[PDB]
């Protein structure tokens, strides 16, 4: 759903994908509303657009 | 969140059957309500879900007009009344909070399917 | 309307074997699978939180396949608590299946 919707990955690509824990950065008590994200879309998509 | 269904009804027909189901817990608006039928001969079929606060009632087909569903603002108690008894109308009735959209937060898409009437 | 039909529900496999649960499909949709399982006289209980997902509370005993117009329930080593009867969610407008599974 995040390779379809939002930023897909192209096979043949230069360079690599850095990831790591953001329970100290993020979590809050009054919880995470601010962030948003698509999940709905009719066909694939296009390499590299907003 | 823990829904709890309706009793019984009478078998006779000749008049409407009513099923409610509470959602002690968790009173959240614009979360849908989905009643399922259940039967020993046949398999479970959806026939609606219904929506408190944006007032889309959404039916199946097969069952028009003769369905009326109506629930609290703040969720709480749902009631579905259905007239025209006939023979063929011996079911059980089971009720899950389906899980929609919400407008408030943007929270939840599908929490899981936890919550279901105990079985009347 | 329509009618999402399905493979007759006459599945039963030995203690160790694969069960190949089918759920067919005549078009294609993403956010809403998810599958149901239902014992006699008891609240049914969701299955699975999508098609790559599982329930929090499942072992890894039951997987659910499936990416376009074929879903299939899969067991690697079967238990004797399996006997109830399985339905798959499709379509928005949601048209519910039939399930049967009895181990013979």
């Known amino acids: 759903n995040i390779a379809d919707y939002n930023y897909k990955l192209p096979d043949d690509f230069t360079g690599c994908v850095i990831a790591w824990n953001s329970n100290k950065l993020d979590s809050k008590v009054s919880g995470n509303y601010n962030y948003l994200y698509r999940l709905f879309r009719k066909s694939n998509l296009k390499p590299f657009e907003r | 969140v823990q829904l709890v269904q309706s009793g019984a009804e009478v078998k006779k027909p000749g008049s409407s059957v009513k099923v409610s189901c509470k959602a002690s817990?968790?009173?959240?608006?614009?979360?849908?309500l989905s009643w399922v039928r259940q039967a020993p001969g046949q398999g479970l079929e959806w026939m609606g879900g219904?929506?408190?606060?944006?007032?889309?009632?959404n039916y199946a087909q097969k069952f028009q007009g003769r369905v009326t569903i109506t629930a609290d603002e703040s969720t709480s108690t749902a009631y579905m009344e259905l007239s025209s008894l006939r023979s063929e109308d011996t079911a059980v009735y089971y009720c899950?909070?389906?899980?929609?959209?919400?407008?408030?937060?943007?929270?939840?898409?599908?929490?899981?399917?936890?919550?279901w009437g105990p079985g009347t | 309307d329509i009618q999402m039909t399905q493979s007759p529900s006459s599945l039963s496999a030995s203690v160790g074997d694969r069960v190949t649960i089918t759920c067919r499909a005549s078009?294609?949709?993403?956010?809403?699978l998810g599958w149901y399982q239902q014992k006699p006289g008891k609240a049914p209980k969701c299955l699975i939180y999508?098609?790559?997902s599982l329930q929090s509370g499942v072992p890894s005993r039951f997987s659910g396949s499936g990416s376009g117009t074929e879903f299939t329930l899969t067991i690697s080593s079967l238990q004797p608590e399996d006997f109830a009867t399985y339905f798959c969610?499709?379509?928005?407008?949601?048209?519910?299946?039939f399930g049967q599974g009895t181990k013979v």
């Open positions: 899950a909070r389906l899980d929609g959209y919400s407008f408030g937060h943007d929270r939840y898409y599908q929490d899981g399917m936890d919550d």
């Open positions: 817990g968790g009173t959240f608006s614009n979360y849908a």
């Open positions: 219904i929506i408190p606060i944006f007032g889309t009632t």
């Open positions: 078009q294609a949709i993403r956010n809403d």
């Open positions: 999508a098609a790559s």
């Open positions: 969610l499709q379509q928005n407008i949601y048209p519910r299946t």
